[model samples]
Target: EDAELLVTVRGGRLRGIRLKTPGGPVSAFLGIPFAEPPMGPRRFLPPEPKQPWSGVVDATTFQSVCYQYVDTLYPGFEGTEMWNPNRELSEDCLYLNVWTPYPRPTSPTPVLVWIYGGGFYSGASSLDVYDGRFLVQAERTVLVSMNYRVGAFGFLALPGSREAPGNVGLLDQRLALQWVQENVAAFGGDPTSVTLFGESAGAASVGMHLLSPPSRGLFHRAVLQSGAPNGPWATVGMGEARRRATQLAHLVGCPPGNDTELVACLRTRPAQVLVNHEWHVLPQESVFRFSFVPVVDGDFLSDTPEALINAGDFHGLQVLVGVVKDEGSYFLVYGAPGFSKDNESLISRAEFLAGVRVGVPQVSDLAAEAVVLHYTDWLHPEDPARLREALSDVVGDHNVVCPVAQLAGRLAAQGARVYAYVFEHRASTLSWPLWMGVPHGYEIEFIFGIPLDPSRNYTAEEKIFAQRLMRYWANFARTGDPNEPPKAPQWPPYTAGAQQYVSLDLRPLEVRRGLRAQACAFWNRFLPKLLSA
Candidate 1:
């Protein structure tokens, strides 16, 4: 009898499942509510603690995912993983999942709380890529995954009203972390040693939490994968958020200017109606302006994250920051509507060249063309294939890699313990286009040991790679340092002077100094010129 599987959390007693694994017996408590359902009058508001249940809550199966517009809502739209949700979806999704190798407390084990990323529009903790069983069992630590609000339901801001000042999604995460601090001790987790980690927008959220004063002391460490708060897509101006919200109201047949009435009308509409109407709010051509994302709400996010980090106003905690080798392929290939393989003709290339200037308003046309020239380095400039490859590098460096590297420099300069890496391994069997090398979020599968293809078995090499990668992460979570267990390869802390990093791949890992030096230098030179203008 697995009597130890039942644990008392904040809401009620939770009876999790006991499963034998390679490491040991693991207890999984799934669909545990950390916060109240943000529905009806509670919609668009900060999360509240979950209402207590009457008796032992059954927490075996995965709960309904936070409401999102995926395959059912948008036809022919495969998600980032090229997989659609098979689980249920609902607004009542302020829940979290926990997996612990040690149920009865001998001592407090290290904890990792994962936050999934979907551009702040779509993602769920229930995804197979986010499974915590392997990591928990292998590392002998408690693993957690939480679901927060996304899309319009989570990030809409009305400038004049306090009802929805944006960042409800962020508040949801804050509340979840607080809940973990309060309740993880019961699950054999050391609340003081909690490490908050995530990929993409999740990574960006971790960056946001680092700057948020309210989030201080909630987690001791952070791992930011392919994102930072200063990333191009991470935040927007309050005016832009208000404009988008007003436009959304008009699209939904509600009064546009009045903030209170608009929010009231939005709250009354069905979740499906709101998610389905998202595509109509923004133009089909605008690729950079995400319709719903975090804004500079005075409470959670006081100012621009770039400014905050530059001023050294963020939490000084140990952090591991990194990006995949090719972080922009997914967006370049799948995000844009008209820029596919079949339609890459001269006209499309012309339009693509012209569109570069749209998102980067500060740079002049000459400077944009200069950027194009700097990235495009071949005699055959007109070839669409070559142009797309160069554009991929440009996009990767501009949005994710440069911002992340710059932030690492800032953090290291400001006396924060920082480690950095670049995931460089690409499987030979990958069927994607060669131009999209190691696409964004590709490292996630290896990080969690969850292959993208369910039926595809991992080779011996792949298994070793996954184990090594997780070991580095697990060790980092165990202690503030990633290069522990002496046998593991040494990963040095990044300093503003040296700017060193470890390159993680299938082969023997080695420390690589000065990440993206040339590209970053180019950006460094032009950014000051552009920003000052």
Candidate 2:
């Protein structure tokens, strides 16, 4: 179906394709290079823009996904296998894909660029979960997603080196945003009206851009779904970053001490060897879920996220932030050992404490005791199910939920239009138990309107639900407000005092106040004060 959907951009002319959605034809241009390949001497450095091509390059196919180990799939949670790299894995994977609603659009449509979440270790633009065709058709927007380097390839935080200063993965994202800023106009997209949005690691990247220096003018609006820069696993310090990089270098038989030799030796080894060996160095951190991540390189991230937020030093834009109700339940089934997965296994009290440390690994013994005291259901001390549910809540709050609350409130206080929501609907397709309601990333399908796709097995009600969600997302992209033109299921703009947020579910979107009031207070409010003391 590469039937003449052409658009000229920086590199060269291109032939694209057309996708049929329920709404209409969506013009798709896949595999457009936004940057030069980050291989060889350029392996660990910030990406440079792609030089112009001589002739028309075929944009009909997806290029290689960024190199990473592809075991995102776990036993019952095998649903994420689709999120893994479908194309060949390579270091030459810095391409972006675009989808516009029509072949010939009279006006520039609002651009909604997507960043996918996979804990920053694995993900791609070409994944089935992030296909932007249906979303573009449903919303009349130009949809874009890009493949950025992941793991050490993207984020090797070897400090002070001109070649491998940290956060190049994020630099890859910034370049992609710059690509949209420069070339999205040719694809019938409004460069001025662009919105950057993502889930998990992608979401954390968006939040980083908000605080990072060179990223200020790239986009005008943001959506951080289920992750933030302040999230427990978001960014690391220089010492920790170098330690991880050294450990990775050592595992792959590279010199670890000298930065120049370390970078040079690691570059000569096979890319797969690097990916395979890096995770074992910090296996406990994997429970929080990411081996190599963005770091506070003092340049890209001048300070930690909380420091930046506290000092009021982030980009002020129309912002939408949200989280899943049970963000950590997915990890319980796949992340930690001995936690409840089958619904029949009773989680021992020690196992619950073990899961907490895994999720928020930095918690001290005193803090752990505080967590148990707060989360324990004193009303039903003997109930095993209560412990299980409390475990999920503790992990979810510490990892995803409360940090977003802190981000939204701080943004609002400092004069940014902020909208907040919590995804509460559980997917019927998941094999997760009844107690694991609304696990992390369950909202991705509905957000992309995957249920509306003909081949996807979804109930009749879900089709309608996906449509409504698509509307909210697209509306937010177009104008910074999710309640734009919607009469019912009104989404309130989050304010510092009111602390309001909308709920995403099968029930009509309800505007509620004080989400997880006590839990969030414990994590965001009480814990910070306690930790400070």
TM-scores vs. true structure, each candidate: 0.92, 0.95
In order, candidate lDDTs are: 0.79, 0.84
| Candidate 2 lDDT trough over 10 residues, lowest sum | 72-81
Clashing pairs in 1: none
For candidate 2, write residues 457-513 as lDDT tens digits: 889999999998999898989878887584675787888789999888889978888
Give the count of colliding residue pairs in each prediction. Answer: 0, 0
CA RMSD, predictions in order: 2.8, 2.0
Off by over 4 Å in 2: 1-4, 72-77, 283-286, 313-316, 340-345
Instruction: Score candidate 2 by TM-score against the native.
Output: 0.95
What's the CA error at residue 166 for candidate 2, in Å? 0.9
Give the Cα error of residue 67 in candidate 2, in Å: 1.0
- Expressed as tens digits, the lDDT of each residue in 411-434 for candidate 1 is 988878999999998865564556
The residue ranges of model 1 lying beyond 4 angstroms of the native Cα positions read 20-22, 71-83, 102-105, 313-316, 335-338, 341-352, 355-367, 378-380, 428-431, 451-456, 487-489
User: Clashes in candidate 1: how many?
Assistant: 0
